[PDB]
From a paper:
Structures of EvdS6 were determined, with copurified NAD+, either without additional ligand or with nucleotide diphosphate. In these EvdS6 crystal structures, the enzyme crystallized with two protein chains in the asymmetric unit. In the ligand-free structure, no traceable electron density for residues R273, K274, or G275 or the sidechain of H276 was observed in one of the subunits. One possibility is related to a flexible active site loop that gains order upon substrate binding.
Numbering used by the authors:
A (entry chain B): 1 to 324
B (entry chain A): -2 to 272, 276 to 323
The structure:
Amino acid sequence: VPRVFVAGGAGFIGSHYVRELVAGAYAGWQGCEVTVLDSLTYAGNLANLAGVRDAVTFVRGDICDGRLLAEVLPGHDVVLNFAAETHVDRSIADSAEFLRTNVQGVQSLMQACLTAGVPTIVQVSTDEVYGSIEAGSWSEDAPLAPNSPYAAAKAGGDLIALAYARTYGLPVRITRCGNNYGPYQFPEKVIPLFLTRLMDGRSVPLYGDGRNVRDWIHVADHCRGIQTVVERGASGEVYHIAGTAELTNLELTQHLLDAVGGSWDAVERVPDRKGHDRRYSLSDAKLRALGYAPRVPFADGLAETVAWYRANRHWWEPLRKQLD
Amino acid sequence: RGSVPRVFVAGGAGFIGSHYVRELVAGAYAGWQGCEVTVLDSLTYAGNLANLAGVRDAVTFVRGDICDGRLLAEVLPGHDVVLNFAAETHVDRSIADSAEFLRTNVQGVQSLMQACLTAGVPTIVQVSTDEVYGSIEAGSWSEDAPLAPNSPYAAAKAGGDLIALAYARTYGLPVRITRCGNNYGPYQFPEKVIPLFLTRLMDGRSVPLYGDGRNVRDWIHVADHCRGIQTVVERGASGEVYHIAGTAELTNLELTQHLLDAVGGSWDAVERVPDHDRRYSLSDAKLRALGYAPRVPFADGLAETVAWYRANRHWWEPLRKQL
Ligand SMILES: NC(=O)c1ccc[n+]([C@@H]2O[C@H](COP(=O)([O-])OP(=O)(O)OC[C@H]3O[C@@H](n4cnc5c(N)ncnc54)[C@H](O)[C@@H]3O)[C@@H](O)[C@H]2O)c1
Ligand SMILES: NC(=O)c1ccc[n+]([C@@H]2O[C@H](COP(=O)([O-])OP(=O)(O)OC[C@H]3O[C@@H](n4cnc5c(N)ncnc54)[C@H](O)[C@@H]3O)[C@@H](O)[C@H]2O)c1
C-alpha cells in the first residue's frame, strides 16, 4: 500500500487531508500508511487527528530538522508539505519565524527528500505570492509580487523548491490556492474568528475600508485539488486551485453576520492592516483540465462550518481563551 | 564635522562592495565628499580586508553578520544609507550546498530590513542579480518580468528581493532593489569566470571554454554597476526594482576571444569542457530615464582588469591556493 508523509498534518488543512485520505475519500488510496510530522506550534492541534488516532503514525518534529527527516522520510511514496507559519497578522508583528519555517524549512525538507529519493513531493502554497490583480485571474505563468512578509516567505519557499526541481531533477509540484475555510480551523483566521466571537456575544473586527477582495474555497475542495496534483501532476510544475466565491471583506462580513445571526453593532472598525493587496484571484483551467472540479458552493460550506463551530465548543473554546 | 550622509555597506569587504566603498571614499560621486563609511562584513572565504587597505582612515570596519539583529540595532542608527552587498555568490557552491545561501541571501535580508525599519534608516538598497529571472534566449528583460531562477543561488537571491519588497509594501520601508548582469574588475575572487581565466593563464595553466561556448551573459564593469547603484540611491523610488545594464552581451565564445586578445594569449591554452542557463539580457529603460548610462566600454574595462591582475599576484596567489 502507498505510504504518505504529511508535514504540517496536525494543522487545519493538513489534518483535513489526512482525515479524508484515512476515510477513503480518494478512490484507489485505500488503507494507506500515513505518517504525520508536525512540530505542534500554537496552531498544531492533535485533537484534529483524534478520530484517526490509531490509523496514523505521529512524529513530533520540525521540517528544519534535517537529521530527523533523514531517519523518517525513507520508505514514503509521497511527501506533502502543509507545515508553515500561516497568519499574516503575525508575520506583520515579527516575520523571523515565517522565513525560518516557510523558506529554510522548505529547503531542509526538499534536500531531505532528494537524499531519501521520495518519488512525489507536493509543496502547498498560496495565491498571495502573486500580489494584486484588479481584473481577471492569474495563470501559473504569473509574476511573483508578494505584499506581506508571510506571502514573501511562501514565495521564497516555492522558488527554492522549483530551483531544486530544475537543478537536481527533484520531483516536486507546487500548489497555490486562495483562502480556505471549514471545520477545525484555528480561530485566529477571519471566518472562525467571527463565528467564535459572535457565538460568545463578543465583537468582531473589520479592517480598513473593507474593499479588499479575496477568493474563498472550502477545505475539502482544496484537498481534492491537491490529490489531483498528487495523482496527475508533473514534476517542476505549478498548479492553481481556485475559489468558489469571490468577495469583498465587506460582503464577507455581511455574509458572516447573516450566517450566525449577528448584528453590525458587533463589528469593530479597525484601522489599516498594511499592504498593497487589493485583490487576489487564480485561474485553475490548468488543473481542471486534469479533472479537478470544486463541489462545495460557498453558502452550503459556510452553513456547514457555522453548524460545526456551534456544535463543537469543546474544540474551540480552549483556543479562543488562549488567543484571549 | 559636515552633514554629508553616513553610509552603511554590508558586504563591503567583498568584490563589488569594496569597489563601491573605494569610489565613495575617493569622491567619485559628486556631493558625497568626506562621507563617513561603516563596513559590516563577516569575512567569509570571499571577504578580504586587503580590498580596503587604502581607505581605512575613512572606514569603520565591523566584523559581523547581517543575521545578527542585536548588532544591527546597535550599529545601524545614524546611517542615512544602507546598501546590502552581503551574500553567498558562487553558483557552483550553491549546487554543492544551498543551506548557507538561504541563510545569508534570504534570512539575512529579513534581518537587515527589520533592523533598518526599527532604526529609521531613510534610504536602503538591496543589491541583486539578473539571474533571478532564469534564461532568456529571446530578447531582453524589464523589471516586471516573472521570476524563474534555475539555481539555488538565484532562488535565494530572488527570495531576498521578495522579502525586501514586502517590507516596502507592508511598512513603507524605503528600500529599492537593483539587478545587474555579471560584474568584472579588480579585486574579484578568482573562482569567478574572468579572474579564473586570467589567473590560470598567468600561471601558464589551461583555461576552460564552456561547452559549445554558446552561453550568453550581460557583462558590466564594476564601476558602472556602482554608479548605477548610486543613481538608485540618489534618484530611485522606494518599492521599485531597477535594472542596471552593461555594454557587452557575449557568448562565452566571444568572451574567450576578448580575454585572449586582452592578455595577448593564444587559443592553444583553451580547453573545451562540458556544460547552466543559456542567456541573460537586461533592458534598463527605467534607470536610464533617471540619468544613468554605462560608461566603461568592454574592451577598455577588460584591458584595465588584466592590468590589475597582472600587477596584483600578491593579492590573488594566496586565494589561488584553494586548489
Ligand atoms: N489557511 C489558508 O487559507 C491557506 C490558503 C492557501 C494556502 N495555505 C497553505 O496551506 C498550508 C497549511 O495551511 P493551514 O491553514 O492548515 O495552517 P495552520 O496554521 O492551521 O497549521 C500549520 C501547521 O504547520 C505546523 N508547523 C508550523 N511550523 C512547522 C515546522 N517548522 N515544522 C513542522 N511543523 C510546523 C504547525 O504546528 C501546524 O500544525 C500552509 O503551507 C499555508 O501556507 C493556507
Ligand atoms: N559578482 C557578480 O557578478 C554579481 C552580479 C550581480 C549581482 N551581484 C550581487 O552583488 C552582491 C555582492 O557581490 P560580490 O561579487 O561582491 O560577492 P563577494 O563574494 O565578492 O562578497 C560577498 C561579501 O559578503 C560577505 N558576507 C557573506 N555573508 C555575509 C553575512 N551573512 N553577513 C555579513 N557579510 C557577509 C562576504 O564576507 C563578502 O565580503 C551580492 O549580493 C551578489 O549577489 C553580484
